[PDB]
């Protein structure tokens, strides 16, 4: 169970972190990234 | 090399040599790691299922 | 004869082999095993000078210095070096091809 | 039959000097004990071909073969590729105590060891027993008594 | 803020390489003082056998007396203890080794060290950190032995280390016989006779072969055991003199005792000593290695160290992490930019990755595991999956 | 250079036995060297000590 735990727990947690928190963040990045490129040009 | 295949070949050779062994003599393999090479794999495959 | 001198040099400087007290097979109840060595070689000029030879004509004992001179010289006397008209030693370095 | 220091001074250093220069060499080490045998190991980078490494090591050792003492040269230098651990242990035992340990070792060496080495995948077989031999245990007191 | 937390967590959390696993067997090594004979080693091996006989878990226990993975002699032994199947077994190999070490640390007269199978098949014979402490400035063997003794004491005082020991053959005493050549000449005894009698007293001489049931076997002549156990027997040897009266060796030999290292180990062309250790419970391999190097920093000048086996691979794995992460990020950046021919989209996809790193680090802190190679694989996988979610939207 | 050197060693290995005993004891040395001298390094005693 040691190897399985080591391989699994990190990916398990990182998956919830990438799902619950990204759905709200990546749109926020898209917003104001095009704003930054407008500011440059 | 492969531990499992080498262990199987060694065991087959020992079985072959048992026939010619004198009476009062006995073969043994007290320590072997080849048998553990398989069960672990099973677990992983089982987990996959 | 010179063969006698060579023989005496070989015998006096013999390089005795080492051993081990208590080595297997060992007697029952043996608890201590220890290596043992002996120095059968000569490590001084005077020791070689004092190597004993037996006279054939009379049987008397003589020393190596009696029929020889023992010194510390060089293995070979083939080459010499002169750096600017002065004695010295030197070696040459050859680079590997390529 | 020489102390570890003798072999270390005479043999090990000369071998390692040339051995140090092999391709894909992660490191190397040497060990000398009271048994009279010295073992120099060379560990190569992971993924390197064992066969190429062994032939390279053989080339480098034959490069430095000349300078070693005469007796060790007569005995010879053994170069081999092997794992660091035992795959298995094959044993012979007498349940009825009919055969002694020396007989068991002789039977193991004479017959079983060569057959096991014949099997594919068996890189090395290390035997912990010796074949039979004739032994003459001499009493020094009796020898000197007769002037021999 | 989340990116900063991810960076801090990745930086400061302990590290390891592989997780421990149970393979149903363990290995015990017995090392006894230099003067120990075969009987003394046999007694401790028999004590170990007796202590493991009652334990239900063990199914087989083979002991090899006279051979060890590090050094050979009459004071070294190695045993392989095999355990029953996991389900029938009611104990782990780690607890078995701990119990063996605790029990055999007082009763026996030598050091017994029970260890688990190596994490990887051919990366060593133990499960711990292996070190080579070497002399880089020609200090000498006695200086190296003093340094190893100091290091052993320092590691013993430390709590991060469970047991730190040295693998090899201990230093031992030796006897040298000095021959009075002048008295030999005075008594008429010829030196070659003394040399021959000394040489053949304690060695096996191979003479010739002889047929035994169709096989060639060696004829070996050696002195009887009873006459080669103590120095008195050696000094009792007699040689004829000029006057026809035997002279014993004791008359013309003086014994002198010294203390020298029996075994010589060398690593990377330098005199070296092999040391081993196992991290204590709740301590990682990286912590143990860091503490070991910090301790070595306190050792005298001219003494260096190098990591070998599993430790070196762990060092390489932990050095390369940042470069691999950066290259994976660059690869995904270029691939996304080429596919969608824009700069904003790939950068927006990159920014998410720290979010997945946050989850991974918090999960491995919550469960208490370490930053091993499997965690690195998981991190690089979460990179791709977070990029997969960011792409699916943007 | 290295390939030529190893080929020379392999080729001479066959002839080792045929040479007199003294030469075999002395051994045969195979090397790859330049025709001349890259440098000369020497030791001198200025005070004749």
Residue numbers in the entry:
A (entry chain C): 987 to 1027
B (entry chain C): 297 to 345
C (entry chain A): 199 to 296
D (entry chain C): 51 to 198
E (entry chain C): 544 to 937
F (entry chain A): 100 to 148
Q: What's in the article?
A:
Three distinct conformations of apo-AdeB (AdeB-I, AdeB-II, and AdeB-III) were captured in our cryo-EM data. Like AdeB-I, the three AdeB protomers of the second apo-AdeB structure, designated AdeB-II, present an extrusion conformation, where the three periplasmic clefts of the AdeB trimer are closed and a channel for extrusion is found in each protomer. However, in the AdeB-II structure, it is observed that the organization of the AdeB trimer is packed in a way that can be interpreted as a dimer plus monomer configuration within the transmembrane domain. The region that maintains the assembly of the pump in the trimeric oligomerization state is the periplasmic domain, where the long-arm feature formed by subdomain DN strongly coordinates with the hook-like structural feature of subdomain DC of the neighboring AdeB subunit to secure intersubunit interactions within the trimer. This region also contributes to form a hinge so that the transmembrane domain of each protomer is capable of shifting toward and away from each other. Within the two protomers interacting with each other at the transmembrane region, we observed three bound PE lipids. One of these lipids is located at the interface between the two AdeB protomers. The other two lipid molecules are found to bind by individual protomers. No lipid is observed to associate with the third AdeB protomer. We suspect that the switch in configuration of the trimeric AdeB pump from trimer to dimer plus monomer and monomer plus monomer plus monomer can alter the interactions between the AdeB pump and AdeA adaptor at the protein-protein interface, in turn facilitating the transport of substrates across the periplasmic space of A. baumannii.
